[PDB]
């Protein structure tokens, strides 16, 4: 019942963002400010310039602000003799300087400052359903809209009752601005704020809430909604029909394993053919191989490759894309208990090929070598690219850091366009090693095909959880391959960044 | 069948110690020593008095005892031409010195070392059944009474079959005589010492007999004998009741969690109003934050402070005190498997504030949270004070050491009062840190109203652990909190002492 | 080099704070506000009452800030139309809404909070010298001028070549405005505020500017200064005189152990005599019992206690005093080599008694030892009560938190006495377990008289060291004994606090 | 007296292998076969074409074993009826298949494997300066040549007194024949080996022979020999020049640090400048931040940076190459005991920047960050590009690898044609994040320009490592620079691989 109603929340997920620019601003607020909360974000030049001087909240005290506000930092004042709709004696105005500095691997808007100036922007805002203007000077529309998305505090809460309210704290609605008419339009950055939230919700979610039947409740009915094929390979069917990876990896749980297939194809001509496959780990206790308590909170977090996925093909398919679609969900619990399986087991993934378990939280692969092998030779059609989000390496982290999701890729041409696509995006990927012939080496068993954890921790390990995927694609697909690790992006501050689908989204636009 | 053997066992308790002095000893016992085991217990500056040298076992080897003894220490001899009932040419008699010296935040009688000189001495004591009698030279009768008891070797054991002989060796029948007839009396002092024997052995029982089923069936009886009222909210009934905390950590053992709550409400006038709430961990495991076995061992001891609650109820009722009483037992079994309660799962108390779960072993906080808002908002009568006790923190030891319970006090004055039953008691305690200011930051949640365990664990940890119970009293309670932790006072060389009881009834008894 | 530079910076040291009140502020400043930066801190209550109203700096816009601002948080403003000397159209306006929740262990004024939001506020402020006022509505001056000192940015830093500008960056000049003309005077309020920030500076300095001779220059210079008497025993000295204990912990280093001890003899007549004894460990990189890098971070401040007591005794000699006081610094360096004294070599301690090491980061206690027993026996005067500090224990923290020191007391009034003392000036403490019987059984040595390490981690660890410390007390001392532990406390947010020296002040200032 | 005649060893160094042709070799030996012992290695495709039919060493048994022989194994025979010089009856003949898969990231000659089937066929050859053929298919000759010689049995070795006779294990003479005249020729390939097996020798030193002192020393011979310029500050010079990472770093150790630089012009005129800095931590405690036993041990390899751009200029300088080279060795041990830099303690580069040390054993980045600055600001000339080569964290075998040394840099062009490289000279690299952005914040100190260890682990670490360094290039530099991490590269199998100056050379040579 909790359950149910967050659900429904998922289900009817709407956005609290809009999104237009300062000519139209102007020719539709006649009446004066339309809000008196307003925050100015821009670099050091975009603020000094001249057009600021016309915004409907300029005066004195801003112009003050501008000139005093530091890099990385916000300046707040209360503006007087600025007209508003509330007639309010004075509106509220932060202003928040964004380096302009950026590095070649970085999205050079720096949405990273974007988004946290405007969350601490934000933390001023109570009441309900409060008007808040957000006028920005960069013009890079998308990955703008991404950060604001993020840090409109549409978060997961169960803080004070608002269980009953949607888990939701709705104390922002909010406008961004513009210079000029944004590419792309407003309605696309709304579909895209829809999504990177719908994400950030399910990704911080608990477990008691989001499991493997609630998780594919919502895709069902998203299903439904946008005219999309379905298909869900549930328990026992999954044993039966040799996907021994995932099924064995959830069948411990109290919520059954399911892999949740969605299909798109486009009304206009393909383009690509495009397969998407997500680990949703919808909790992990790490199984016999039991995580100490410091790394097993949040672990309702290993689900955030599926929920990427979901919430990229949600916006890919609200988008009419031209690009025919599969979207596979990994859906599984870890955990312990007497039907657990065991280190030392021997699984026989779908792929055929036999894995010999010697630790059962290196899981995640387990269960996206069966959604990869079913992706590659189980569907309809032939994608020519296969994309795997996952978030599970704490070696991520080490390798790539908090903010590059690490890209493990068979294709030296797509995995500059993917990179790109991150740039764009403001959620930023950077490569790890892609060399086969010494990755397998680490997954050598003497009794089955291979084992499922390196032998040497030390030995380019994100890239080896990479291989393992890899291994199980089908023999036939010869097309590229690209394999994220978002364990850290996902997340920031302790709360999920909705990170995943807006990348996706980018790389698939710019598809031909 | 043990399980049930070992609930008849409780259900009929009776101790194995009796009360007199010395001139009471003198007017019925004209047959000699009445015993040929005697024990001899005081200062140096008792022990020399004139009054000794008459002493019905007083000879010239007793009095070269006397003057060799050393301090903490006992010296036995066989005493000659010392007439007794069982006619033996020699009666034992072993001397103990007490050392005088006593901190004020100790016991001046110093109970401590009169327990162990009594215990090394009752270690001779081997045949069924065997009369000894323990000269004391101290007058102060309850913390005697005490020591007396948790030394008299009733505790739980089932060894050599003892299994089918109710789960107690019952080597010794115990005489305490003092110099003047006792206060509290004889009968007072004999039902102390039986309910401190009582949770001695609730304590130490195994799990595989004492688990929540058996411990409420425990408290029904004796509910029954002595016409007090019973309630039980068992298993599912508490999870729709909204008492997720304790349902929550107790829901994935094979025996249900319970909420037992006992009620007393005296014949004579009421002089205050008391609320007890324990602490019914019947066993630990640590659940998903699973303990390593050293510190699991000894965790069937996690359901302490329900003991030692239900310990000083009995006792209260026993004595008739002129105090309304309820008495509330947190039963539950933190077990580990698939319907175990996760590290990020949210749950909702029945103060219906929300608790984001970041470590599953700091669980006995959870259901003393439902009990003590239970004991607020839940039951016929508005307490005055609420004591929750419970057996909790490892931290303890490191605060207050193990012989002093610490103190977790919302009032300067109360602290006192239970200070000084503490030190008559002999049962101990110390205060930790008041400043809630400073420890509700400890749990916060970015997703719930609160965390359960504490982000830095060197900031007061003991003290956090009751902040967080208060958290979840009722809003309109404005009375007097005390929190207890007795996590080491509870045992001693790696058996149960029986504390907590006889430190209730001494504070209890001088309310007003 | 960098060293000489940095003594004469602490042989010359000012503080940057200034005291006031509001009415004074009126009579002197006719040309309106003599800055354009403004901090005004009160409570929800304080900052509504009227008498706010007619301040130079209030406003409408300060009167919005008002309402607006919440609890532990500023609001920030640009307030027009103000008079001011500059005759700027703005002036930059902070306010901080200070909680008035306090507990009966916490300063009502709530210092730690006052502290904070000054801190927060400034951080806008770099340029050179700049004057800020804060005006205050609390009138507990001395833990106003504490937490005001320790937030004016005169920390220790050798940030951008500011080792030759004295390790100081000098950017707020700042003036603190009372209700009234407060009690303590202004001119003794910055005596105790640069006690605080000399101390912060002591704290903070690393060791290869701080050892054991400079630190021992920096006490002599200041002898000099302030017409004291000084002794130093150094190195060998210390060998050959029988300081066993803290000539063997600090002989492997590179600058030599030392005692230095201060007196200070009144002009008036005086019954009260005072010692303090401060644990003087310049590094301590945990000797043979090596410390991991995580542990060893911050360890330049186990000089913390001896800082405390030195800044302590400044205050009260520039004060002038009526009591009569020695301050003996225990100074040295524990070293890692082949010199070092080593787990299992037995110390002959100057109180006569022999220490068998069993752990060589057990090292403070020693070289106090030492020091206690100097100012019980070898000292001109015979003290009524002995206060030593320390930073020593990372099981401090667990016992009683971050904010408070841990206090170890012979005595129940002088205990009580001590805690007003700290409750008054901000620099909050709370008792630890007084047990000696419990504790002394710890330090069993089977070739010594006793250990220097707990036997038992779990058992009142705070209060053994405190104990260890005591055992070496002269027999002949009879007076009040008060141990702090002040590991924590010493420093909040990575930076020092200055800790110490005002609760001394007061604590002092108070006695009868 | 070892340690002379282990700088006699290097000083005097000449390599083992030869390089031929098929064609020459034909038209020089006309007795047949030039020795007994012969090893061909080449792909399945390779070693099955008409060609092999013709050489000296075919015959029946060979084909055969062509056909038998699995992938990566060899496959040996006693080959009859081969003319040979010696008149043997049989020669012995290993087969050698080599895989031809390799990765966009690899090397497609996978000297990998050769390295590895040559080192195996050479564990059957004891004798005294056996005389060895290898005839190659492969036809790329630097990879090939690097391969042989890290292989080829010269290693550093004390065993069975050969401390008398240069600490080497004469028991091959390697010929490798390749199909045609190699590219480049056989007298640079020679000058390539005898570089890969000098640095071989110098990393697998124990520094009880290879110090500061001498490596300083076997630097300074080889500077007089080639005609180079060399200088070298030395211990206390360091500190009185402001070289305070290095300085500090070395200080404890019983041989001095020292900077140690060799220049070179050429004859001819270039644009060309290049400068090289290396990590020479002769031997790596951990210091203060002691490492734990099984991390410390390959510690002597710690100066592999150092030994790979003194080997990688002495090459450049046999072979003439225009390019203006200067060559900055960074030497020292990080050594335990009284005078080691602290934890805590702020050190002054020669950047004039600040540095908190918070880990003893992040030292490499310390004596770098000197090397670096002396190279872009206190040398002739103003380079073009900057090498920096170190062992210096485990986080890289996680991040890129066993056999990529993880590349940081500053210019995505530069980075190419430096991964080109480490392609065609088989030492292969792999970049590593650059983002100066996200790292700088890693080493945020409250008391100094920044701290020398990541304040997160799991955050990009090989990049920050990287970062640091970069942060004390002189302010002037805008030159390319390269960052490179070859901690695990430098071993395989527990021995040296003489990682690093084939690399560089291959670089250079291609220098536009």
Known sequence: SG?????????????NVEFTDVDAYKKTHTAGLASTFVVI?????????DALKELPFYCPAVAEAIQRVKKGETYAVLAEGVKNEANERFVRVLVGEVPSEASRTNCPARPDVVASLLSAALEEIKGPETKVDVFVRST???????????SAKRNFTAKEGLATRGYCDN???????????????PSELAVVATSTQLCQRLVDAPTNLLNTATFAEVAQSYAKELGCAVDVICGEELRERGYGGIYSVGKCAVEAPRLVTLSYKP??????????????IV???????????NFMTGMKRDMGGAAAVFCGFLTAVRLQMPIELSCT???????????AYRNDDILTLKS??????????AEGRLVLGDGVFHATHEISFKPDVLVDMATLTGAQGIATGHRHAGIFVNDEEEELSFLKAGRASGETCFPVLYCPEYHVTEFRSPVADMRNSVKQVNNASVSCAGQFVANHLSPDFKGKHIHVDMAFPAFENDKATGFGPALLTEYLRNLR
Do not use: M, W
């Open 267 to 280: 009304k206009d001509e393909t383009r690509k053919k495009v397969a998407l496959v997500g680990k949703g």
């Open 352 to 361: 055929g090929k036999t894995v010999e378990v010697n630790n059962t939280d």
């Open 3 to 15: 359950a149910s109603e967050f659900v429904r929340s998922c289900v009817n997920f709407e956005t």
């Open 171 to 185: 104390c922002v609605r909010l406008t961004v601005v513009f210079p000029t008419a944004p590419n792309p339009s």
């Open 140 to 150: 890079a529309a998308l990955a703008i809209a991404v950060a604001a998305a993020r």
């Open 329 to 339: 969900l990994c859906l599984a619990e870890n955990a312990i208990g007497p039907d």
């Open 41 to 49: 974000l821009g670099t050091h030049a975009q603020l000094r310039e």
């Open 283 to 293: 909790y992990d206790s790490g199984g016999l191989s039991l995580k100490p308590t």
